[PDB]
Write a protein that binds this ligand. Structure first.
Ligand SMILES: O=C(O)CCCC(=O)O
Ligand SMILES: O=C(O)CCCC(=O)O
Lengths: 311, 311
């Protein structure tokens, strides 16, 4: 009887969003602009298709699900993607544009994007927007530093890993969806609903990323992600010691297959997949208060799509 | 007859400002804080005496010259110094905390300070403050990129050099003094007066810095500053070619004394000193509309002090 039993697939999501996404991409091009040639060249290299990405998609779908009557979500989407791009540039120094243009330029163009995003925020003329994004971006910075601290630390806890995911990835998604609610003057209940959707969706996406690494860039650098940690926690004495050493010394690739084996035997990747599935469902469940629309259906489909590669 | 004929000296300026400056330094300590250990350690290393510096001094003197009735200038001073410190950290990558803690951490803690400064701005509850500082910080980023472009470029013009000084140094001073006017709800005329004071003061300070380099860190890196450029422009054919090559190749120290000689013969350092003197006087002249007070006298003394080492 239910003709719309299937969740919305990616092609339909992307077709639905396309007019908004192309408008975001155009705004990003016009906003990347400065008189300074190097900014324009590095900018082109890193953000020429910036409006055609996941965080802008989320943002425009959220705003349309909330019946936005302006084009302020195009500005918001560009802000969010500039924050993401600035973060990426800076993270690749501390670990690409920095390989191509140097650490220095990548840092400074990161700052150019970052500061420009705040200038765009000011055009929205909302102190609440500034509060939300200044809080979010400070959290991101803290999360990136916490991540850098955890590197080579085999005593990293599950809670600390999850705090890194939350701060460095999920918080920006959470802000984007909350801000769609702010711009459209929604109730506290609806704002909370959208905030939770973003937070959990972003969590799902990062968990899946960490799974797909092993399904070993992280291994190489001594990065303690959940699959590697969980394998260490549940492995036999020799397995645990191999992984501890890999984390401390970065020599994991010399024991690549034994480590991958430990992950299989302990169900470490499975456990991480379970956490991703949970986040995805929590995101979907958060949208209960939201009015039905094709944009709501797209947000639900995105949550399904986030964990598709993992089932 | 005039018992106060002498401009206020540095000891009197610093004594007058000390209660405010110690309050700024305390706020900076409390605001540097996070749960993340590395932020607290790098933070301590770079900003533990941040409230005892030139930009906070300027800011608190400006606000008191405008009869501020709150302590919002302590927040402003901390914001300005966080912006400066974040910039410095980032600039030292692209060229110290990065030598000590690594490029990566220095970049990210820079971002922590930067984003925290915006969170502090939000506490001032003024959209105009956010507009001014988002504009200023984007200008700084652009200026830092323009500087990086000019490096090793012997065709850099005087106008381009001055644009770098204006964007990378003077604009932040200009914002600080303008913002003292914004916080104390001054007229447009008084705001303009304070803005100009900061702009010209910051210009003076940077010119003096560039003079004092030669009075050869810049030489080493192919940096085209006014003294080196002017020497090239006015030197004989052999002198000009030596300096052109030094800029392009960074081999200037192999011709250290001939270059220094060219600067002497051409009056290149003198010409730059003349520009610094001019900026200093323009700053003093901008304060004409400001009500008399000991804080006004301190601002005037600071402008004199800026160029003292050069006369
Ligand atoms: O509701 C707020 O104003 C706080 C925003 C923090 C966030 O959830 O992203
Ligand atoms: O007056 C304004 O609102 C613009 C501030 C730019 C500046 O002079 O620093």
């Amino acid at each position: 009887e239910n003709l719309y039993f299937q969740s919305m697939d990616l092609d339909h999501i992307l077709s639905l969003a396309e007019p908004d996404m192309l408008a975001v991409n155009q705004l990003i091009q016009k906003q990347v602009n400065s008189d300074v040639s190097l900014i324009n060249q590095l900018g082109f290299y890193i953000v020429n298709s910036g409006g055609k990405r996941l965080r802008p998609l989320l943002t425009v779908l959220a705003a349309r699900a909330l019946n936005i009557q302006t084009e302020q979500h195009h500005t918001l989407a560009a802000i969010i993607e500039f924050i993401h791009t600035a973060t990426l540039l800076h993270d690749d120094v501390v670990d690409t544009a920095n390989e191509v243009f140097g650490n220095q330029a990548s840092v400074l163009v990161g700052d150019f994007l970052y500061t420009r995003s705040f200038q765009m925020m000011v055009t929205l003329d909302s102190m609440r927007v500034m509060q939300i994004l200044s809080d979010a971006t400070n959290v991101i910075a803290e999360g990136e530093v916490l991540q850098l601290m955890n590197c080579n630390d085999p005593d990293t806890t599950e809670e600390s890993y999850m705090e890194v995911i939350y701060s460095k990835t999920a918080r920006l998604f959470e802000a984007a969806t909350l801000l769609a609610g702010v711009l459209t003057k929604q109730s506290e209940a609806i704002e909370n609903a959208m905030q939770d959707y973003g937070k959990y969706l972003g969590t799902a996406f990062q968990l899946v990323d960490d799974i797909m690494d092993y399904a070993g860039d992280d291994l190489a650098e001594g990065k303690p992600t959940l699959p590697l940690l969980y394998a260490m926690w549940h492995g036999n004495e020799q397995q645990t010691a191999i992984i501890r050493e890999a984390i401390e010394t970065g020599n994991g690739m010399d024991n690549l297959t034994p480590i991958l084996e430990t992950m299989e035997q302990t169900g470490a990747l499975t456990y991480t997949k379970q956490q991703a599935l949970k986040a995805s469902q929590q995101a979907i469940d958060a949208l209960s208060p939201i009015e039905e629309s094709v944009y709501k259906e797209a947000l639900i489909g995105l949550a399904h799509i986030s964990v598709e590669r993992v089932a």
